[PDB]
């Protein structure tokens, strides 16, 4: 997260870290046994880390749970990033508490101008190496479909939205992928892609979660 702020320990209890010997992507807990992330974050033998703040220091209150299943959307395209969504089933249900809690799925899509919360342990600068210990947060508005398409000609599908700032300086970045965009207490977006980070007229692009609620429900119901 570039241009954001320190969230505060466990203030985003649905935020998880995906770990392959190191943090490589974020995710969102949507119920006690299922996590939503990005399809490009697919790996085998993922360990999900819940209740984390400082990813580099053992606090004692974290939960580490192995993934039992990882299911990417059947229409995911790694070239266009259309349908960049994945579900991870936890080997066992997480213990729910003040530090580990599920985020609700939307019944309707969010509108342009809605302020959302974007979070993660990604790069905090637009060049070089500036990775945080603790979870970072950014308040960012959903941008109009028209401005999103103008920023990224021929690249925005009906399953994507832009959020952030056209002036630059405030964005998600490498390490944030798979993480939450939460608006009015609902998971509306997944950190997906952008042209660099926090660049002028290049806002972050996010998977449109409202389009996947039915698919999520059926996937959980069949696995």
């Amino acid at each position: 997260i570039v241009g954001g702020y320190t969230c505060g320990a466990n203030t985003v209890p649905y935020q998880v870290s995906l770990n392959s010997g190191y943090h490589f992507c974020g995710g969102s807990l949507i119920n006690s046994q299922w996590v939503v992330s990005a399809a490009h974050c697919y790996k085998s033998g993922i360990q999900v880390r819940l209740g984390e703040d400082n990813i580099n220091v053992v606090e004692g209150n974290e939960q580490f749970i192995s993934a039992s299943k990882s299911i990417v959307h059947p229409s995911y395209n790694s070239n266009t990033l259309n349908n960049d969504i994945m579900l991870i089933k936890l080997k066992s249900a997480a213990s729910l508490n003040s530090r580990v809690a599920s985020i609700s799925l939307p019944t309707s899509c969010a509108s342009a101008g809605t302020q959302c919360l974007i979070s993660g342990w990604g790069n905090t600068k637009s060049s070089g190496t500036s990775y945080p210990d603790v979870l970072k947060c950014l308040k960012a508005p959903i941008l109009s479909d028209s401005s999103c398409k103008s920023a990224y000609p021929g690249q925005i599908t009906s399953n994507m939205f832009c959020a952030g700032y056209l002036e630059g300086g405030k964005d998600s970045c490498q390490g944030d992928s798979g993480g939450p965009v939460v608006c009015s207490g609902k998971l509306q977006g997944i950190v997906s892609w952008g042209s660099g980070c926090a660049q002028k007229n290049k806002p972050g692009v996010y998977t449109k979660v409202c389009n996947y609620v039915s698919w999520i429900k059926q996937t959980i119901a069949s696995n």
């Binding site: 190191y22 943090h23 490589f24 998600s172 950190v191």
Partner: protein, 61 residues
């Protein structure tokens, strides 16, 4: 024998926002160098280990 053309390709993080530690041959400094790849749309100048990079593209500087 001339090295593969991949040694002349630029570093490409790509558009995705994952954290994938990789290596690339930097044709400006002349050395295999760590970088953070985003997870999609990379080119051939992108290796999982330092040795794998060096095997294809030896140090010039």
């Amino acid at each position: 024998e001339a090295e593969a053309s991949i040694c002349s390709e630029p570093k490409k993080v790509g558009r995705c926002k994952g954290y994938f530690p990789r290596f690339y041959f930097d044709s400006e400094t002349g050395k295999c160098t760590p970088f953070i790849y985003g997870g999609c749309g990379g080119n051939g100048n992108n290796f999982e280990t330092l040795h794998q990079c060096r095997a294809i593209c030896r140090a010039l500087g």
